[PDB]
């Protein structure tokens, strides 16, 4: 056992806020925001030895990454964004920061009661988006 298990499995949207404010800020345009805040993505955590992989899977997109801790990856977005990715894992919570342009955005996932709560945060504005289990 191990590191993540507690995030591993098939988890489904539950409630989103703040998300077409979140997807703004990083510059996700119009058309874009509203299908995207329409999806309602389940959420595939996985882990096989040191490498986890998310899958985010919609009527949008089907978007895959696969990664070790600490080890940073090239990761195209759904908003196709090229960007620089490292993931960790501190005091039990998984940050993602994502560099592009010179930008930063970080998403963070939690455990928290039977939820895996997502925090994304670009600039002042943060979307919380939760998960229970499929
Ligand atoms: O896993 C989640 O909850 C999170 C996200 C998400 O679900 N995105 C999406 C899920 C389906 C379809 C589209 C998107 C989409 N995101 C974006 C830009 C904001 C990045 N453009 O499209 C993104 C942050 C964490």
């Not at 389940?42 to 089907?62: A, H, L, Q």
């Not at 801790?69 to 490292?86: C, H, I, M, P, W």
Request: aromatic letters at 8%.
């Amino acid at each position: 056992s191990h590191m993540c298990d507690a995030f591993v499995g098939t988890w489904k949207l539950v409630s989103s806020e703040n998300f077409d404010d979140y997807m703004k800020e990083v510059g996700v345009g119009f058309a874009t925001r509203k299908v995207a805040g329409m999806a309602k993505p389940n959420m595939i955590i996985s882990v096989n030895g040191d490498v986890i992989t998310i899958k985010s899977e919609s009527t949008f997109k089907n978007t895959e990454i696969s990664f070790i801790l600490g080890q940073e990856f090239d990761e195209v977005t759904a908003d196709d964004r090229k960007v620089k990715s490292t993931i960790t894992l501190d005091g039990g919570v998984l940050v993602h920061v994502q560099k592009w342009d010179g930008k930063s955005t970080t998403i963070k996932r939690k455990r928290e009661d039977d939820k895996l709560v997502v925090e994304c945060v670009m600039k002042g504005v943060t979307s919380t988006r939760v998960y229970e289990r499929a």
